[PDB]
Amino acid sequence: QGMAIAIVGMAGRYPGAPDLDTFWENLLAGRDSITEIPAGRWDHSRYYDARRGVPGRTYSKWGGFLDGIDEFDPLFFGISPKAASTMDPQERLFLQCAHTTLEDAGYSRGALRAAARARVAEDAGDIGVFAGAMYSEYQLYGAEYSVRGEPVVVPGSLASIANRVSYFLDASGPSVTVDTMCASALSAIHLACAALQRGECGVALAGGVNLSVHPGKYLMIGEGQFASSDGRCRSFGEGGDGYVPGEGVGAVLLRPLADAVADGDRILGVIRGTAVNHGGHTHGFTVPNPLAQAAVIRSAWRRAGVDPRDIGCIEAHGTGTSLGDPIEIAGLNAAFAEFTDARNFCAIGSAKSNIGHLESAAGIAGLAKLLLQMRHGTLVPSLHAERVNPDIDFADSPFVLQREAAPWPRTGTRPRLGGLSSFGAGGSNAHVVVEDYVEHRGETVVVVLSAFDEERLRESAGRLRDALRKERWSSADLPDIAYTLQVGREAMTARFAVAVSTLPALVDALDACALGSGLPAGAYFNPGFQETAVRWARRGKPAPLAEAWTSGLAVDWARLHTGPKPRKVALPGYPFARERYWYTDGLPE
Numbered sequence: 001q002g003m004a005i006a007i008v009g010m011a012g013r014y015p016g017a018p019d020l021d022t023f024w025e026n027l028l029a030g031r032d033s034i035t036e037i038p039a040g041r042w043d044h045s046r047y048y049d050a051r052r053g054v055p056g057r058t059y060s061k062w063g064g065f066l067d068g069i070d071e072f073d074p075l076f077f078g079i080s081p082k083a084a085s086t087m088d089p090q091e092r093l094f095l096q097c098a099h100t101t102l103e104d105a106g107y108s109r110g111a112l113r114a115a116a117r118a119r120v121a122e123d124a125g126d127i128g129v130f131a132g133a134m135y136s137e138y139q140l141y142g143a144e145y146s147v148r149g150e151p152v153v154v155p156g157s158l159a160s161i162a163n164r165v166s167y168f169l170d171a172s173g174p175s176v177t178v179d180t181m182c183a184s185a186l187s188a189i190h191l192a193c194a195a196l197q198r199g200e201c202g203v204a205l206a207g208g209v210n211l212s213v214h215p216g217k218y219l220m221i222g223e224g225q226f227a228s229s230d231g232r233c234r235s236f237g238e239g240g241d242g243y244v245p246g247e248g249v250g251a252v253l254l255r256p257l258a259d260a261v262a263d264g265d266r267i268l269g270v271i272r273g274t275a276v277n278h279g280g281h282t283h284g285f286t287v288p289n290p291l292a293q294a295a296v297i298r299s300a301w302r303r304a305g306v307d308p309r310d311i312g313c314i315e316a317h318g319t320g321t322s323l324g325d326p327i328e329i330a331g332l333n334a335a336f337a338e339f340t341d342a343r344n345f346c347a348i349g350s351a352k353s354n355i356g357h358l359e360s361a362a363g364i365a366g367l368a369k370l371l372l373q374m375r376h377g378t379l380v381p382s383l384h385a386e387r388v389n390p391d392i393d394f395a396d397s398p399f400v401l402q403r404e405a406a407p408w409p410r411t412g413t414r415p416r417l418g419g420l421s422s423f424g425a426g427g428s429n430a431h432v433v434v435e436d437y438v439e440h441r442g443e444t445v446v447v448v449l450s451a452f453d454e455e456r457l458r459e460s461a462g463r464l465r466d467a468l469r470k471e472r473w474s475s476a477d478l479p480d481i482a483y484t485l486q487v488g489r490e491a492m493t494a495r496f497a498v499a500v501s502t503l504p505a506l507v508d509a510l511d512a513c514a515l516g517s518g519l520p521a522g523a524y525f526n527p528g529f530q531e532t533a534v535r536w537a538r539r540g541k542p543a544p545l546a547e548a549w550t551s552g553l554a555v556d557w558a559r560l561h562t563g564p565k566p567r568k569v570a571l572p573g574y575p576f577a578r579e580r581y582w583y584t585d586g587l588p589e
């Protein structure tokens with residue numbers, strides 16, 4: 001049966017991919033997003049040296065990097081701009097990730113709490129937050145400054161990553177940051193699923209964050225020789241002699257499947273089972289254990305109640321290590337061997353070949369790739385493995401290394417089944433089992449839009465306009481779009497409302513608002529009785545309600561949709577202000 005935990009929303013920010021849609025495009029095109037160290041971060045010429053193991057140097061100069069990790073919208077989160085400057089970028093980016101995930105799920109803060117609270121006991125929490133992270137590097141800058149100047153305070157609390165989200169969301173569930181290194185994100189998901197199953201909270205936000213903000217990490221992988229000579233993760237490829245670090249922030253909104261189905265939530269997939277263990281005493285602290293990996297994979301399978309023969313795809317750890325890669329396959333082989341003797345039926349690959357080793361966030365990026373493959377029914381290439389690692393025999397294995405884009409066909413009406421592994425360098429292992437889900441036309445709707453100020457509002461109109469021009473959208477989607485923007489967004493200061501019945505009309509109105517030109521009739525803008533107006537709107541006269549709402553009137557939009565409720569759909573998230581904050585702000589040179 002499984003623990004039946006539904007995924008009702010997701011957000012992701014990965015190298016070369018500001019959002020999940022872009023991430024899929026990169027994955028589909030087999031794009032390599034690895035680059036050299038951005039000059040803005042630090043002067044890497046002070047540390048680079050091609051000779052392995054040189055003291056005070058590093059032979060790696062590559063990485064999977066995000067763009068503008070110092071960009072943040074503190075006013076949006078009720079954080080003072082002064083506080084933002086000394087606040088760990090990981091906390092900042094996870095805050096923005098958390099919000100985007102709620103918007104993808106089609107939930108406002110208040111709505112999410114209400115939906116969660118109804119499913120658990122009185123004194124049980126509503127929303128839980130489980131974050132995975134392993135580095136506190138921002139802290140180091142403050143110390144480097146304080147020694148040769150005036151002492152500056154730069155906090156290094158990993159708990160803040162989860163705690164600030166809980167604070168912002170007004171969440172009352174468990175608020176936990178976990179560190180199991182590379183397996184952190186998957187460990188967070190594991191604990192989140194356990195909390196939901198146990199009834200500790202109604203919904204749970206689970207994810208991971210990992211940034212490369214300091215050169216120290218590179219001096220470390222250089223000394224320990226963990227870094228690859230070519231700055232690539234050759235997942236199961238020949239010549240892989242280490243990994244390349246990558247940046248990333250991701251999260252999922254988790255919920256018991258029954259509750260999601262009953263609430264008409266989007267369902268991006270279902271977590272059937274999770275498992276967590278440790279490699280024990282191997283021949284070295286950072287030496288992986290194939291038997292432990294096999295055990296955690298089987299444990300997740302048993303908890304999921306699945307038949308491993310049906311597994312269509314495995315998203316592997318695949319860091320591109322001399323010892324690690326063959327060990328991982330050995331672990332997987334031992335796992336499958338306890339159930340079937342079948343060969344070459346399962347696909348395998350790693351996103352790390354695309355975006356690098358995201359470490360504490362590797363699992364959430366991996367989950368994204370897996371869910372996206374199922375969503376589009378397409379298996380994506382795994383890079384840097386034109387010739388496979390000589391130590392690995394895929395011919396005598398359950399697997400076939402995915403090296404070309406290919407269709408992932410559904411067997412009958414049976415859900416596509418996938419597996420996801422993440423193995424911490426310190427020995428902590430994790431495996432997650434997921435499967436996908438199987439389940440007023442033409443009328444005038446009222447499309448609503450709000451943001452912090454006028455500029456952000458017109459920005460939202462533009463991004464929504466650009467989205468609704470894509471091929472997937474038609475006029476038949478208008479009831480879903482309107483519903484999502486009503487009950488799935490926060491009613492903010494600057495507001496925009498328009499009554500439309502066709503999609504091209506909505507696009508025109510959005511374009512007008514975005515460009516600040518003249519608005520049509522039935523459209524209302526504001527830079528910043530209900531019972532009567534809602535009855536009117538339910539009778540097909542929504543203009544007085546829309547105009548009143550734009551003027552600032554609070555509106556319980558749910559009252560409008562009490563035959564069948566429209567579907568929540570994926571719409572563009574809030575356009576955060578991109579102002580730069582760093583610890584050197586205000587400090588003398």
Ligand SMILES: [Cl-]
Binds near residue numbers: 109110170
């Ligand atoms: Cl609130």
